Structure formats: structure tokens, C-alpha cells
Symmetry: C3
Subunit: 337 residues, 3 copies
Amino acid sequence: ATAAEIAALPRQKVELVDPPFVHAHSQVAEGGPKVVEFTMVIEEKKIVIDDAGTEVHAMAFNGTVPGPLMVVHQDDYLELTLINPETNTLMHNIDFHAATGALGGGGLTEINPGEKTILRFKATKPGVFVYHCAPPGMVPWHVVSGMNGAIMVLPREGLHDGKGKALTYDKIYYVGEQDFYVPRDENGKYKKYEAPGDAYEDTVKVMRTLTPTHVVFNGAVGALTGDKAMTAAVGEKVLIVHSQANRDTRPHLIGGHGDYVWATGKFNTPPDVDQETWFIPGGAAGAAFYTFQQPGIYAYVNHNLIEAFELGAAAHFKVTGEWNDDLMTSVLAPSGT
Amino acid sequence: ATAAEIAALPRQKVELVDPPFVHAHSQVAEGGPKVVEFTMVIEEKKIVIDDAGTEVHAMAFNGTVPGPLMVVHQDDYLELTLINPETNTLMHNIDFHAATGALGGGGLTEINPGEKTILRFKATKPGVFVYHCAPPGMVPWHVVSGMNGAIMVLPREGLHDGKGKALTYDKIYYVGEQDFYVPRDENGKYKKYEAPGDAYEDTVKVMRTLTPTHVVFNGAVGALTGDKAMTAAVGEKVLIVHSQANRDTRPHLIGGHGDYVWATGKFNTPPDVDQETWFIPGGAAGAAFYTFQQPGIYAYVNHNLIEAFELGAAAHFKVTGEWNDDLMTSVLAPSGTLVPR
Amino acid sequence: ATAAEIAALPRQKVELVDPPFVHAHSQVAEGGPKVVEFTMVIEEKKIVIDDAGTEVHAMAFNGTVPGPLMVVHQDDYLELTLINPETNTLMHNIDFHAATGALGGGGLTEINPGEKTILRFKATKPGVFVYHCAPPGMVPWHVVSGMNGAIMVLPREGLHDGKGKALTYDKIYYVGEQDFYVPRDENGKYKKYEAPGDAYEDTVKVMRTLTPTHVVFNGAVGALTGDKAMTAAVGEKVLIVHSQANRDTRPHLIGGHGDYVWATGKFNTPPDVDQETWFIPGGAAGAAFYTFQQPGIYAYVNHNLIEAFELGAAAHFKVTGEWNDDLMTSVLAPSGTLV
Ligand SMILES: O=N[O-]
Ligand SMILES: O=N[O-]
Ligand SMILES: O=N[O-]
Ligand SMILES: [Cu+2]
Ligand SMILES: [Cu+2]
Ligand SMILES: [Cu+2]
Ligand SMILES: [Cu+2]
Ligand SMILES: [Cu+2]
Ligand SMILES: [Cu+2]
């Protein structure tokens, strides 16, 4: 498209919402290509990531870890206003893995506290994609302080299976998984600090072990449970988008499956089917579609079960509806032999 | 299917066999859906996992690590009687990743010592799938104590390649890979404990390093070697099911390939072909089909070679038959002069 | 093929070049099956791998880490002369994951210093494949001392997408990624050793932690950056072959994609498309095809960004050509209240 063709397209402003929900959008595009406008404000903030009161100095797009999901259609333009408020201490930027050129946008969006910038890129490839901060010389430190999220670039005709049949979800959730590297003192207790830059050296030492102290969804142990358990009903079709900007993961729905999984996250790569556990490499997003068939509490985990049940990587779905005895029944409930 | 329709189905009782063997089955289903019956007793038992004599309190379905492979066909029902004998100390249950509902059956099968339960599920999706114990609050410790295995839900029509041509194997093996996290003392020697519970706190510390001390097939270093090597002949078609309930692996047949690999384990996902090394994420099973072309000893490994040769993840195949110099020949054997060094 | 037919095939000798470059070849085969002859000399030598002067006693096919890429077509034979010079100290051999039999050739190629051997195998399967040394009983030590590379067995009709359209690259690069395990003393300083065997017990202790001290391309931190960046132009089609003989990696082109990725490395498995980050398990090679669309500097990384930017696994591409403002533009450059 020429600059005059892009000038003539409609603009749409979107209000973002906190993960794991996703802002309003249409699965099939409503209209020709648009320039879709988003704004995120970077907040350097303390987050508490476990029930021992462990703290992280988060570097949080729109104040959440992960940052929020942006949704556009293929060949729309995503136009981001990124703001780095004067109350922050570090320079930040943004790399969209969905984008083409200038290190994903990072080369064009380096903003010191008190600056803003506006980047536009054409979303030429359909899929779910990581975005993350990447300041030269400090890249993994920002990413493993929670400065990452994902976008979804839907095909203009919505999702389809490998054979071209429509897949339409009722619900969509976004699970961002985070590896944290929290320094400990000589007694094994997690250290606290009064500014992000005070933890830097201690944290690089833990990062270089390649062994996270915590692996969590939505920024904390247990965050996607209780008030934030994800909801569905028997018969509803749910898309679960999962990202991990730095480290591999292997998502699994305990008691369910991934009926269709774009494990690579890319919708022109046909999805795998009937998955028990799928694999998303560090630096990517993936998406699984499932139709619930049984009610109950489900857990949703990274299936390194030490990562899930010792280090924090477990969420719940609460699912209403009628039990199906054909699919599963207790013929004899636990009872003396 | 209604309760009445399920009741009218034929029942078949299977006698399980120990890994890496798989109980007798038919590749193509014989007749219509069935309720296929299995029984396993859980044994908490000390096992040795290396030639030094290192000792784990295993938590073993049917007394083996891995637990045995159960084979049914798509839309059969798998009906398991699971028994937790009164000589065990812990509650156990089972989660079938092939099943739908109640945490894969875990929510409906928590048995204390002295209890049994019968779970039935419809095997709706074809593939190989992990199963493992999962007591709430203690899940990884049971699974990395060996309490996991796999099932295979064959399509009713048997296996096919991605273009629909039949793939019929002559033998099958099940390789269960287990990461173990054994505590060490102040000088670096592995510790032994009187009961499973005495090991718990020291074992969780090693688990949280995410670094196994042992990574093994069939429960111990070298278990599938020597008189326990797997075997085949030139021309024979072998399916190798591989599972890992907790941690990634990357299987490889040294001197062979995976001609067709369902790396995800799911038979409605077309298999990769011509693979050197395939990848099975923790929490899953996969399957590779190969036709042997050359005789001799092969190794089958996790191709993190430190895991294979330092931590235990290496098996052998002994293959009989004639050597094929078209496929490979030593044009000049190692030769030269005997030099000082 | 009868014995006289195999004996009558043409023999062609090919000169290797050092990674990340690849020897000249044709994408579509030229003529019928041939026996393609290569020779490699193994060098044991000390290499420096980071800006602190840390040393590895490298075990290097053809004198490089990784060893060079050999390129043949499907149903050619690859006939390698492997030479272990008398100034080396260790026995070595070679396992081609592309080959069938004898542990990939390792059982037929065990050569002490002062020996040579010639192995021929039929390249029956198309794809990129690891090769590595594997002396029984010391396999991971040789591989993590750098003794590994890859080959490419192209289909005779060249590459194609999943629909059958031809995919023809202008350029090809081979990135071999290496995990090293360098012992440290109790102050955290990397240790140095007189002879390669002197480091063996300390190095296996590091190996057993499963945590590399360094993760590098072309054998050293920074080897493919700066003035050693790989190059392309806007409009150019580039195939990037990547291998890792011992440990998983997850390549990513920062500011680009893998337009077609044979993530398994095998050309009869249809490529994934539009990839951000692909995944190559330890013990395999993979290949990504991309057409560059934007000029400027790119980084090409293992996207565990701690492995990329703390442990060494980052390369650059320098790309010439015109900026495309349709694909990306700065609507407002970084700014505070005033311009
Ligand atoms: O089935 N997840 O442990
Ligand atoms: O070729 N297996 O090391
Ligand atoms: O986009 N690589 O960090
Ligand atoms: Cu930042
Ligand atoms: Cu990135
Ligand atoms: Cu148990
Ligand atoms: Cu599970
Ligand atoms: Cu060697
Ligand atoms: Cu190998």
C-alpha cells in the first residue's frame, strides 16, 4: 500500500483490558484494513509473586504482567502509543515479533522516562505473537522482570482448521507465563529492594543459572485461581492463548485436551489435533482451541509438574454444566478392598 | 451412548506385561467397541536405579517403572480397577491424559491404603497418552518417584501415514523415561532412606533445581541393555512408544531414523517423516515407526548426550541380518601408522 | 543398484569452506546420482571463547567449531576422508545422522592420531542433519568440545513449499550453536588446562549440572556479530541452517521471521510458515527460509534471551536496501514535550 492508500483507511481506537481477559473484537474482520490504535503506559511497580510476600520489581506494560493482549486482523496496521512516565527510572522500548523491521520496532521506540512514541506496523502474518521490551545491553533483564505480552493477528476470515472448516470460539483467555529469578540471602529467604536497578547484579547471577525461582501465570503463584479462575460451560468453545517470552513451556489442560493447537502460534501452519500437552518455545506464543465436555474445576499447567506445583505454573478453569457418564464414570468409588 | 448401550457391549479382560513389552493386541480393531478391563496394583517398593546400587522408594503401578502400556482402540471404554494395598503408606490415584473429565480420572480415584476403585472412560481420541498419579499437594513427588506410564488408543482402522496408506508394525516397544532427583550427602554420595516419607523434604530440594541426578529408561541406568536389549531384524517394522510424564526428551535411534514420527503422540495429527531426533515435551507420549535396514547394535537415546551417557538415558537394539554396503561401506578402514602421543 | 552401477557413478571432489559460509552447490541436482567426496582434517587446539580469555580445548572437524556444512542431493553418496593428524592426542570418529548403519558411521571410523579412514554412505533422506564425533564411552565430551557440524541433503528437485511451489534461495548460511561447560575455581574464575584430558573430570562435573557456561555460534561469543555479521539485501531470499548436536535451541530473527521453517530439518515434512521463533531439539538441525523486506541491523538469537545476551548465543545480519514505511513507520519518534 502507498502512503496515500494508508492515509485513507479507517482508524479505530481500542481500550485494552487486563489479562487473562481480552478486549472486545470480532473473529471475522468487520470492514477492510484499518489502522487500530492502542495506548500502553509502562509502570515500574512492585508485584508480589507468592504467598511468602516475595517481591519483584516488575516492568509492566499497562501495569500488568503479562502486558495486555492486542487483537487485530491480518493486513490491519497496529498503531501503538507507548508512554514511559516521568515516575519511571529506566529507558524502555517495544519489539513486536509480529512486525517487520528495526528489531520488531525496538530500534524506533527507545523512550526515557518523560517520553512517548508512536509506532505503526503492518500486521502482515496471522498468528499469536510475543511482544517484549528489549533495551540494548539489558534485554533479558527487562523481559524476565515481566516486560512482555502478546498480540493476536486473526485471519480476516477468522480461524479455520487444517481443512478450511471455520473454528469459532465462545471465549478467549490469554495466559502469559513468566519465569522469575529472585535473589535469596544466605538463609534462603528472598531479597527485597527499593528500586529496580538495586537488584540488577544479584538478579543477573540467578538468571545465569538458567533456573527460575518461580514460574507463574499472570505474574504470581495462584494468580489465575479463585477470583481469577477462568470460566466456561460444557459445550462452549474456548481459545487459550499462551506466551512465554524467554523460556519454553508445555501447556496442558488437566482433564481436557487441546482439540486444535497452533503450537507454533501461526494460523497459516495447520494446527495439531487431539493434543494432551503441547510445546511453546521461549520467545513465542501458541493457542489451543477446546470444547468443554465435562463440568468441574480443571487445572491448566506447564506440565513440568515441578514447574507447575512447586514453582507456581498452575491456573484453574471453573466449568458449569451436566456430567457426562458416557465419557467418564466411577464404576466403583474408592472403597475398602 | 446410553447406560443401556454401554452395558450391552462385550467385555475383554487384558493380562498386562512389563515394559518395554506391550500386551498382545490387534492393530486393526476386531469387531465393535468393547469395555476393555485392566487391573493394576500400586506398589510402594525400593528399587535400584544404577549399577552403584542407588536406591529410590518407587511408587509403581503394577510394580514397574514405568507402569505398563494399556492398549485399546478409539471409542472403546477403558475400565481400570486400581488397588492401593494396605501395606502402602500413601494415598494414590490416576490421571489418564487420554480421558475427559475429573482431572483425567484423578478426582474420582483417590484411594488410601486398603482401598480400590474402578474408573471407566471412553477413549475418544486416538494416540499414545501419558497416565500418572496426581494426589493434590503431592503431584510431582509421586510422578518423579516413578508413578507414571502410558496408554495407546489405536485408530479402529490401525495406523496410517499422512496420505492414508496403512502403516503396520511387526513389533512394538514402550520406552518410559524417568527423571529421578536423588538427594546427596555433604560429600556427594546418594542418600538412602527407611520409608518414602523420610526422603520427601530432601527430594523436593533436588526437584526444585530442575536438574535430575538420573534420567533413565525402564527404571534404571542400562535397563534396556545386555540380555535386556531390544531386538529386531533387517526389514522388520518397529513402533517405539516413548513417554515422559514430567520433563522434555528428544529421542534418537543412533544409526537409524524415525521414518514416521507422531512426535505429539496423536494419530490424527499427520506424522513427521525422516526424523533424526524428535521431541516429546514433558507431560506427553510420542511414537516413532522405523523399518530397520542394517544389522548390528544400535543405541536409542535422549539426544542430550549428557543425559544419555552421563545420566542414564540410553538403550540398545540388537539387530540381526545382512549388511548393506550400498547404504554404507567402509571404503578404507582406519589405517596409518602407530604414532607417539 | 548393482555393484558395477555403484562403481560406475561419477566421483566429484568438493572443497569445503568454513562456517557460516557454505561451499558452492546447485539447489536442483546436476546430473544423476554421484559419489561426492569430501576430506576433513581433525584439529585439537585451544580456542578462546569469550572476552575474559576463557579457553576450551576444542576438538574441531576441519579446524572449525562447528565443522563445515557438506551439501549433497538425495540418493547421492557422501564419501568422506577423515584424517586424524599425528599431532593430535585423542581417538575420534564421525556419526552422520543422515546415514543408515553402524551408529551413523561411528562404528566404522574410529581413528587414532596417525590414521585416516574413508566412509561412504547413501544419502537416502532429504534434510539438514547433524554430524558429530562419538567415541564410545566419551561421546558427550567430544560433542561439547565442539566436535560436531551438519550436512544438507537437498531434494534432487531443490526445495518446495507445502503446496509444491519452488523455494529458491539466493544465499545460505550455516549457524552451528555450541553449549560449552567450562570448569571454574572456587572464586568463579574459569580454569585453564595443559592438555585436553586434564580437564575431563572437572568438565564432566559441569556437564552434569545441565547448565552450559557459554552458548555460542561459530565457537565463541560475538563470532557472528559486528564486522563478522552475516549479510543480505532487501528482496534477497536466505536459507539459515541451524544445528545443535547436544542441547535444544529456539532460533529467532529479531525484526524478521522464518517465512518457511523445516523446524525438524527434514524436507519431506512440510515446513511451518510465518514463524516468530522455531525450535530445534538437541541432536538435530533445522532450516529457515526468509525474504528480507527491511534494511538495517538484525540480531539472530537463541530466544532464551539469557542464553542469547548473557551466555553468547547472538549473531547479526546487516541488510542493505530501502526502508519500507508501509511495513513499519515511526509516526512519532521518542520525544517529551517539545520536538
Ligand atoms: O494432567 N496433568 O498433570
Ligand atoms: O547419533 N546419536 O548420537
Ligand atoms: O525479538 N527477540 O528478542
Ligand atoms: Cu523495559
Ligand atoms: Cu524477541
Ligand atoms: Cu501416587
Ligand atoms: Cu498430567
Ligand atoms: Cu572426537
Ligand atoms: Cu547423534
